[PDB]
Design a protein that fits this description.
Chains B, C: Its cofactor is Mn(2+). This is part of a larger assembly, with four copies of chain A. Chain A has about 375 residues and is an alpha/beta fold. Helices cover about 40% and strands about 20% of the residues of chain A. Chain A has 13 helices and 13 strands. Bound molecules: chloride ion (2 copies) and manganese (II) ion (4 copies).
Chain lengths: ~375, ~350, ~350, ~375
Amino acid sequence: TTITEMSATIVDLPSRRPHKFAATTMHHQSIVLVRVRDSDGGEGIGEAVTPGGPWWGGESVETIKTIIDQYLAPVIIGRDPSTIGVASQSMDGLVFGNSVAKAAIETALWDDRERRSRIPVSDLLGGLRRKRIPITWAFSAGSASDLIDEAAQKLDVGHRSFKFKMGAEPADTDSRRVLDVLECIPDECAVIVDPNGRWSELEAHRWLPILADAGVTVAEQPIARWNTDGLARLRDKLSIPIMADESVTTVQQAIALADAGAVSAFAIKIPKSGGLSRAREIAAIAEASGLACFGAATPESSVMGAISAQLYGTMPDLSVGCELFGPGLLIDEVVTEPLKYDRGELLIPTGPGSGVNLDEERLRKYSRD
Amino acid sequence: MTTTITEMSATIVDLPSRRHHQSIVLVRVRDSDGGEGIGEAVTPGGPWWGGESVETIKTIIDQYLAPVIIGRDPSTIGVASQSMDGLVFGNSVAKAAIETALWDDRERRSRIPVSDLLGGLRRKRIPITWAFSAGSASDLIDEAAQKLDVGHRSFKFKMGAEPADTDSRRVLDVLECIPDECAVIVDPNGRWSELEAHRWLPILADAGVTVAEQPIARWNTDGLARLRDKLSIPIMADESVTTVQQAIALADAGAVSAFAIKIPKSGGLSRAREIAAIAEASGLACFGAATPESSVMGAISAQLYGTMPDLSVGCELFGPGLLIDEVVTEPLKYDRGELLIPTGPGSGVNLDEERLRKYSR
Amino acid sequence: MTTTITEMSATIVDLPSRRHHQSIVLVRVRDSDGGEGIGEAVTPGGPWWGGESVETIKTIIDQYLAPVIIGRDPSTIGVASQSMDGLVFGNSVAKAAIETALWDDRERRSRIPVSDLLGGLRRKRIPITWAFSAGSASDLIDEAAQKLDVGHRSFKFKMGAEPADTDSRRVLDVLECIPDECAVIVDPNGRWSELEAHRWLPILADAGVTVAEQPIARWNTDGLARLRDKLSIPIMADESVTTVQQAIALADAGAVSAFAIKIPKSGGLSRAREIAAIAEASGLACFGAATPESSVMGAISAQLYGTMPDLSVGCELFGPGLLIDEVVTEPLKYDRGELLIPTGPGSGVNLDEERLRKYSR
Amino acid sequence: TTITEMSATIVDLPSRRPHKFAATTMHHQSIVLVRVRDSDGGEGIGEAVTPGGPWWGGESVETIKTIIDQYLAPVIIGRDPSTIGVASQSMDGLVFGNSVAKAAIETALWDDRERRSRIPVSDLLGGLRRKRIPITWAFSAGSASDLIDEAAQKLDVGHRSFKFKMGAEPADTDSRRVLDVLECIPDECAVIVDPNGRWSELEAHRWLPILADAGVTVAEQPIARWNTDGLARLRDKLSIPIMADESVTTVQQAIALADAGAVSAFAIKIPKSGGLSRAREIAAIAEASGLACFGAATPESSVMGAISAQLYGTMPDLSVGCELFGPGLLIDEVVTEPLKYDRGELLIPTGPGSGVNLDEERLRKYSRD
Ligand SMILES: [Cl-]
Ligand SMILES: [Cl-]
Ligand SMILES: [Mn+2]
Ligand SMILES: [Mn+2]
Ligand SMILES: [Mn+2]
Ligand SMILES: [Mn+2]
């Protein structure tokens, strides 16, 4: 039994509202959908996804396709579908980095596995430890006006956990904006703030404590990804914990941080770690070193969101919470059944493989020209 | 509910060996679908190494660990491990026995080798490193030329029972006729003092020793670090890596060159693997170590070692080969000094019911 | 406005070599005054080294980087680099290609070598260090006595494709007839494990190896530090120094003896220089390294290496010499095994339009 | 093409008010004006300047001239004007230290370059990143009476950033004085305090927090230059950042501080670093290590002020601000066009070279007898 075909198709997905990060605003969602067909007719799907282009991690849907088609494909076509380990090491041997590219393949491979065996990947991992996850709602960098009307409404549906996306505008304007919205958020809530590593060490130390005073509960990647020391000084001064996101993309980084004592938590995410196995390993290192985990978002459609949801359900710790709200914000998808939410909670897919299936009409419909 | 565990048993089993018995505790888990999974608790030879024994293991399992296993969904191995940790501190070998049994049950329900749940094999055979007893000079110049000509190119002299000085003179004597080209591990079992390790270990390195397995006490991180640096050979932790937090501490402290991976001390498949993952992330090497064990633990282990990225220190799963009989229908096959990785569903071995009854204590 | 960039193009170009093609992406920037600057994106041979390829580079440039280049004042190279960082994480080789092209355009508008903007040359020629392929023993005893008699007194054996053990036996064989007086770098490409580096690297040092370029993985600072100290030879980072923050970390951690300076991995002229400045401030040595590249990147590089305070590890800009043809009117001149630093405006080379069309993919 | 002459002339410049530092009060300004004439008739100018004598850095206008005339000249006369790199290394090879001396030559050399090429030095550097810089107004150590009338007026013209010069009198009197003036300064402002490294570790820890409570925003060199540890302990205790000035004069010091984690920022200044290249390198190290920069003053006339202004405009970071107010305080100069201010901002010279030209009548007029 061998892998027979693998296609990588760029898909654009209509999105319910624009999503402004530090270096772009996202007007729709863009993924590469990977497909792996095997010798006796079984199929797996993976997704490559990015927070609106190469600003975050240097990968783009356009270049992802190419790396997959041209440089990765050769170690996947004709291979034994069950040898995901060797396929991952093969890919590393031909291409440095390009983790979002590797993630979509490694992940499609696991989906294939789950479906050949007729079980959810979460089994292959040792089984779910929870069936539902509470979702952390992430506000866009929009105005404080819009967000007070959005907060009040999401508190409604049931969320008690929030994230403010930051870094699109100077520290000082940005923090006033956020302090504004925090006025109409109950004291009891979790609030992460995520400047996407765009703040200076000076700005971080100026504004974080002011925001912690106003109820901000966690600081996600406040300063640059390589500034381990600065992160460590912050972790000491601050009354609130610091989470690595951009700073943890590999198991080696996990270790370096853990023991430089540079952060309080990991944001765990498949694409950025180059797949399901590596993502768990990073979380295993959090466990081994007593750091918390967050079920983080890229964001992604229901394809990657589903395998992620299963991951996060196998994980021993998501004390920081989970932000898998992304799919909820898409108006359409390439799956037959997108992720189901309820009263502000994700229900973990249980179907075989990743737990979601292609809809080939939608795929065709939303393929990019 | 879906399928549940209706039954678990733990049976002490004394198997005949060439050294005069290896005691194990065989765990047996049953589905509400009549499916069964098996796992093995083993100890080097009782509580001297960790603080565990077949007699005490049986109890821990029967009385303290079973209440979180009976009733549950088998697919929930993680919650089972977590629930065990919560009721029982330590007792890794007991834990590993249940945990592996569960992985066995899954492999056999899904119809695949457990190596597939670990993302497949990266290799099909593994060269075996042969370990001599703490025996007497002559016998080892015999036993080497035997196991040597039959294929094995990698070796370990078990040390610790003699006084370090004469104990060296013995190991040094055996060595004088082992090809300088071979790989040699020494394993004092952490019984050497820091001073004996510094005086005797360079001398053996010169005589061709390749790797010092746990020369000094398990808690002595600084000493281990002092040695990793003062020697021309790598240091390998064994007694010192039993948990994922220890693996991390050692990496950090630059204490050792390599980790010995074994499933029993680690408390199960997932944990031993996690430990190996740490070795990879810090660029330390792995050894596919042995408790030792029969083929129950041996099989699942060989599958684990098979899926592992790194196994460059070698692999010493020779243990089953020393047994005169077994409680599986089909013991681990070896070939010109290589182990042949079990390929069938679960761990890839199954009970011989007659023999299980014959060797039960 | 004053002068603006009206146009930028990126063309994939496959040039014939003696190993069967070096792919580059040639960048071309145009003034609103009809002035042009050129720059080269290069990869060792695709995404294996960094994660970059000519196909993906072209895209990054055409679609993601150009929106901050078209329109702007050419003199504003700094704001251009900063604006690129902001839109694209990583992708240094793409970035370097635009950045150098911009420096080219400036040099050629001002009528001076870019070396003048860097505060002038400190030297006119540079001895070239010759790098052998990961080839087979015999060929390298041939190719040495050739490149040796033609002048070269400094060498690098590319390693990593073979298993460390035989790979050494090969490099050790070639060495036995290279004058003990020569300089020898080894570059496993970070493919060696910590253990293989510790066992094999002393042996080559004895056989006359002079410098270990990136023996172990790029992230393994501690291992690099452990080696810098346990060896009798210097360690040189390459894969490990791609940014100014990495250079600083390594200095700090006492991890390496020297840095390999290359413009592509560094993301441009200013950054590679900044990295070299760090080497000076910490008293680590520089090597004038190679991607390798054709004469586009080669020229500007040779000018950079020319302005640098320290180049004592040597310089390995032999790359263009291996090309059968080129896309400049006038390739880098060599002489009795020394490179002759380009002297004309900008990078000191210019397009051959016929050839650019002939070798375009 | 070769350097033909180089003269070094001591100039005294009438100054609008006296400037009291820790170890003198400055009654006028004193510079050595360096001139480099080349074979085909091109000229560059540099300035050597000092904060009122050798108290700060051990250099004086009188000894600067001598080092230039006697020991530096020999590697500059007859040299290729474009080989600034080798000229700098040559100078280091003959004279240890004497950075203000080296700066005036290295800098004159760059001015020459810019003018031969007919462009602003800022081009040679990679181009301006801003055309204007807001200026930080530095009060003298005068009485708190005078300063309340000066603060109120400078706030007027447009400044929102201030520095209090300190160290002329005991810590306790000094800080009360400063607290006085801070009463009539708006909360929103930046305030640096600069004791010129004259405070003890005890005094620093006593008074800094009291001053931070009253609105002081940065502490410049509070303790001795060599007390890296003490600086590091301060950086930890304090709610406000610490800036190295006297402690950063070389690229090696930059590195040592950065990674002893001893300060929050660098004060960048050409004279003290021995020139334009070295000054950028120090700033490059700030970038590489995530420390902020300040466009610092010596102060200097418009000659050095102009090349500095260009430097600071090329720099990626001046988050601490810029204090190039010095020239504004001179009543006359040796240039034809001094630095232009507007509504409390410096406009960066754009003309070729350093961007300012000699006025040979003024030079003659203000040469010292
Ligand atoms: Cl994010
Ligand atoms: Cl000052
Ligand atoms: Mn984030
Ligand atoms: Mn042992
Ligand atoms: Mn290299
Ligand atoms: Mn100062």
